[PDB]
Amino acid sequence: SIVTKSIVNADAEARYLSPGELDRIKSFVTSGERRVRIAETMTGARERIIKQAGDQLFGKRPDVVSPGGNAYGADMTATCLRDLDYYLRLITYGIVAGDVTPIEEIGVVGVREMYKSLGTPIEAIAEGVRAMKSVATSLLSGADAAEAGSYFDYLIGAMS
Amino acid sequence: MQDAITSVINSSDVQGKYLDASAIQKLKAYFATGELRVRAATTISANAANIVKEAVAKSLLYSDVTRPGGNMYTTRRYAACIRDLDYYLRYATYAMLAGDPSILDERVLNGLKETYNSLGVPIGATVQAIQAMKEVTAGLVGGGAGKEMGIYFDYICSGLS
Ligand SMILES: *[C@H](C)[C@H]1/C(=C/c2[nH]c(/C=C3N=C(/C=C4\NC(=O)C(CC)=C4C)C(C)=C\3CCC(=O)O)c(CCC(=O)O)c2C)NC(=O)[C@@H]1C
Ligand SMILES: *[C@H](C)[C@H]1/C(=C/c2[nH]c(/C=C3N=C(/C=C4\NC(=O)C(CC)=C4C)C(C)=C\3CCC(=O)O)c(CCC(=O)O)c2C)NC(=O)[C@@H]1C
């Protein structure tokens, strides 16, 4: 989080955090409860979010579920939905941390090499994240929706 | 390094689990103390030099350590020593801010004892000086922050044993 980042930065300069850095951690902690609340709402609706996003995905990209597609078959479709779940999970981690590092370090570095090896069209994964973004933020208030949306966008941009 | 937030995220991740109620209690507990940590960090930062000076005065000055033959003898070694104390104080503050001692294991304690032993830096005296900073610090940040800081001051001392 920004606590780790500020520390690592100050250390690179062999100095104590600056007042500016301290103010950042300050805000970070007071908004902590809001972010935790956002993450909880997404965790609770986990199953519904994956079902609907999955449905919207296969609707936009029937190919992946049709014959010759990477997710053709009850089992491959299941595994595909399993991956969507992995990412929703990472996103709630991101939200509580206040930044994308958990999403990045657990599911983005090497993501292109992993999916290319499995033959999974990464553009379709991104579409699945777009779908989740839609179902997930629809569960939130205008303010929170925008806030959580940014984490989805980061992920979408990292797969495109 | 991990902070109190990422620490909870990693243990959840290794289990492949969404944040638990228990995990959420830990997050909330850190957030509640966040301001306290920032206020302590602020004071310590403003008194860093005086904290080190008093600790040295109280534990190392006017002993065999500073006289010819002592490890703190020669201006180069005296400075190297107060430099180390400045380090322990700065890193203990980081760890207190993060609510986690990992930065200590990774950036401070790794190979420290061996280095000290190699150079002949007395660990017992170094530990005494850190404990003295512990006391001087509590008296500036107050009992609350003082005990938190003490956890990390002790962590370092333990890693030198
Ligand atoms: C769903 C939107 C898309 C889809 C997915 C799909 N994935 C697999 C197989 C795997 N996916 C992973 C994924 C991850 N591992 C990680 O560590 C992370 C980050 C947290 C992710 C996201 C892995 C490891 C596999 C391998 C199987 C395993 O889990 O051991 C499949 C199966 C493909 C196969 O050939 O067996 C599928 C179908 N496929 C699509 O077409 C959608 C676009
Ligand atoms: C002061 C309380 C005691 C003391 C210290 C002393 N230390 C050294 C030399 C080194 N100290 C370190 C320690 C660190 N270096 C770092 O970068 C960090 C941050 C994580 C730490 C904690 C290291 C690596 C050295 C060796 C390299 C260097 O000099 O930079 C000296 C000098 C040793 C010499 O013979 O030149 C001294 C004197 N000495 C005492 O007597 C006190 C008990």
From Swiss-Prot, chain A:
It is found in: Cellular thylakoid membrane. Signal peptide: none annotated. Component of the phycobilisome. Heterodimer of an alpha and a beta chain. Its main location: membrane. Keywords: Antenna complex, Bile pigment, Chromophore, Electron transport, Membrane, Methylation, Photosynthesis, Phycobilisome, Thylakoid, Transport. Belongs to the phycobiliprotein family. Gene3D superfamilies: Phycocyanins (1.10.490.20). GO terms for cellular component: phycobilisome; plasma membrane-derived thylakoid membrane. InterPro entries: Globin-like_sf, Phycobilisome_asu/bsu, Phycobilisome_asu/bsu_sf. This is Allophycocyanin alpha chain. It is a peripheral membrane protein. GO terms for biological process: photosynthesis. The modification N4-methylasparagine is found at residue 70. Contains one covalently linked phycocyanobilin chromophore. (2R,3E)-phycocyanobilin binds at residue 80. Light-harvesting photosynthetic bile pigment-protein from the phycobiliprotein complex. Allophycocyanin has a maximum absorption at approximately 650 nanometers. Pfam families: Phycobilisome. It comes from Arthrospira platensis (Spirulina platensis). The lineage of its organism: Bacteria, Bacillati, Cyanobacteriota, Cyanophyceae, Oscillatoriophycideae.
Swiss-Prot record, chain B:
CDD domains: APC_beta (cd12126). Disulfide bonds: none annotated. GO terms for biological process: photosynthesis. It comes from the Bacteria. InterPro entries: Allophycocyanin_b, Globin-like_sf, Phycobilisome_asu/bsu, Phycobilisome_asu/bsu_sf. One of its GO terms (cellular component) is plasma membrane-derived thylakoid membrane. It is found in: Cellular thylakoid membrane. (2R,3E)-phycocyanobilin binds at residue 81. It is a peripheral membrane protein. Keywords: Antenna complex, Bile pigment, Chromophore, Electron transport, Membrane, Methylation, Photosynthesis, Phycobilisome, Thylakoid, Transport. Its main location: membrane. The modification N4-methylasparagine is found at residue 71. Gene3D superfamilies: Phycocyanins. Contains one covalently linked phycocyanobilin chromophore. Belongs to the phycobiliprotein family. Light-harvesting photosynthetic bile pigment-protein from the phycobiliprotein complex. Allophycocyanin has a maximum absorption at approximately 650 nanometers. Heterodimer of an alpha and a beta chain. This is Allophycocyanin beta chain. It comes from Arthrospira platensis (Spirulina platensis). The lineage of its organism: Bacteria, Bacillati, Cyanobacteriota, Cyanophyceae, Oscillatoriophycideae. The gene is apcB.
